[PDB]
Symmetry: D2
Amino acid sequence: MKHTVEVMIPEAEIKARIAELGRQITERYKDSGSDMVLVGLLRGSFMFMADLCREVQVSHEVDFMTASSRDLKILKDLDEDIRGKDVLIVEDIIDSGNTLSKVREILSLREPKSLAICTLLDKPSRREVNVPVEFIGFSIPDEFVVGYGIDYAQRYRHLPYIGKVILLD
Amino acid sequence: MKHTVEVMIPEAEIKARIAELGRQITERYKDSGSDMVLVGLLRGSFMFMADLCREVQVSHEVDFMTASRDLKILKDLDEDIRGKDVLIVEDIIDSGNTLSKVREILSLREPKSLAICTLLDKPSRREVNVPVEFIGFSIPDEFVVGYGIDYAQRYRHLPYIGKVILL
Amino acid sequence: MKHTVEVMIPEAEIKARIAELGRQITERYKDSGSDMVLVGLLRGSFMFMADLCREVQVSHEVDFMTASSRDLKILKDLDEDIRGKDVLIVEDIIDSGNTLSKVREILSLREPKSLAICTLLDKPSRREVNVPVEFIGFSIPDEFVVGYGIDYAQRYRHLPYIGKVILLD
Amino acid sequence: MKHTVEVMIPEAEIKARIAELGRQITERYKDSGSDMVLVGLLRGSFMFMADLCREVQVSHEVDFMTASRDLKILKDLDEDIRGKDVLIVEDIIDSGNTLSKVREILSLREPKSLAICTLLDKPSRREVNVPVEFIGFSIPDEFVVGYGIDYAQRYRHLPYIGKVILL
Ligand SMILES: Nc1nc2c(ncn2[C@@H]2O[C@H](COP(=O)(O)O)[C@@H](O)[C@H]2O)c(=O)[nH]1
Ligand SMILES: Nc1nc2c(ncn2[C@@H]2O[C@H](COP(=O)(O)O)[C@@H](O)[C@H]2O)c(=O)[nH]1
């Protein structure tokens, strides 16, 4: 405890990147024809999902799922079916790559037309389980970050920008 | 089922209202001191929650709950609300039955304070007296979609509030 | 850790008591007319519920609920509605009286015709929150007990009898 | 909907079979060494689970799961099954689709071993090849109730397996 937070990725930049991601997601699926659904992982992805789904110019459903972050268990499964649909898992950040990994396995079992992941933040240096991540907003070093869904002791989750937890002594 | 969606509340108007609500909500708890948490009711309020919490200038946590004749908890909160100021975040209120119950349930956990902030309000359909401290818009009884709200699992992604036309 | 378990309440005695409880529950509701449902609290009440519901000679539904044992939260709510029905919460043991207390408040909100509690074991000396318990199988001192649903470090939950954890040194 | 329930498998026959299953299941894992857990699928198997685990003479944990076109987890396990022997406890298997999926899901968690033990089996209705290591009874395609199984949320409390007659 005892710290401060400084802006790392300004709100305006996040917006710009999400717009670009939006164009990409749109391009990648506009011609699929079949149903599409962006699946967000609670709690972390609520804000990113909000902004992102608005930038996706292709009709889709929005469902949320919440898995325990040693066994990965489902605390709240999807409400809608994903069989035969293009599914785009949406997370705020990927580091160890464990949850996204297992969640992706769980969902493939329901035999969807396709499965891809989209994460606002990517921390390559922390990957433990290799998992394919199609769309990434920003690649950053292993920095203590908060905001935009990412919390620190139940805090900063509502920050419109990505912050860096400094930590005084 | 064939239908049309017409804009009802354009994106900019919502943005502006959310900003006002933020100010109001901020002014209301900025001096509480106790911890604060905004509770969104899935699925419909995820978007409203995302934009609203950014406009709330007071350190708070963000949790979600999802409730369904009896009102049952499909997914409870992750946080304890006891002794905290709790702002329930809803997308829309009409009958008033659901918020009515969800509020009762949370009240049992004895929070510092309990309140509700709904984006839309169709007071023409209330069948239950329920305290609603914050309202973004009071509206006609139209079938609204967008900004989180759906229609046959559709339209939640629209950045504006729309009305289904049907024919 | 490092211990042994000795029989405290033999399986045959448990059966006898449950039969008696069964007669009582049956007597108490046989003339209600309205729907009845025994609500069990997982994990602990699964075995007790199994035996008990068979001793209740009055048509009823069997539903389960599972609440976190500081705020009491619902991890899995009831599947069926209880409004206007006689509800009999079923637990393996009541001590502090906290969970049963909150669970009872949660359920009264759904306005059932009636709410009562039935617990196999009662530990009066540990009550922190006073809550009415209509049917009790056995009243025991604050003993380290296991079996019949009550576990000790994920163990003894399948014992057909109530045991006492001795604890060597 | 008007109907009649006739006994199909009397209480004593079930008691005896459960005893046998216990012996079999016991003999099968008594030398594993690794931790063991029987997983019951709510709601229907709660009774079968209660009687079966008592007949299993090997230290184990007892957990429950409840699954629902897609097979979704309404309530996951409380325990981790990784590296443990897992015995899925079901009340009845017919199509085979549900157990089929639940098994896939648990398999992902990499348990020491995975198996299924169902009380009833209607092999005349299988549409999916699924491994079932233990079966209490193989039966005709009757509509069974009792011993946990229901009919319009009714009859789960019967101590015997019955068949609905309809007229
Ligand atoms: N899609 C959609 N859902 C609605 C509408 N009006 C009410 N609802 C549903 O009813 C709930 C609110 O119920 P209340 O609190 O009034 O009982 C909302 O969470 C929402 O899911 C509407 O116009 N469109
Ligand atoms: N009440 C009742 N449920 C049944 C019956 N046959 C199948 N089921 C349901 O189907 C599930 C098993 O499905 P399966 O594994 O064969 O796909 C059981 O958990 C049960 O809930 C029946 O005769 N009566």
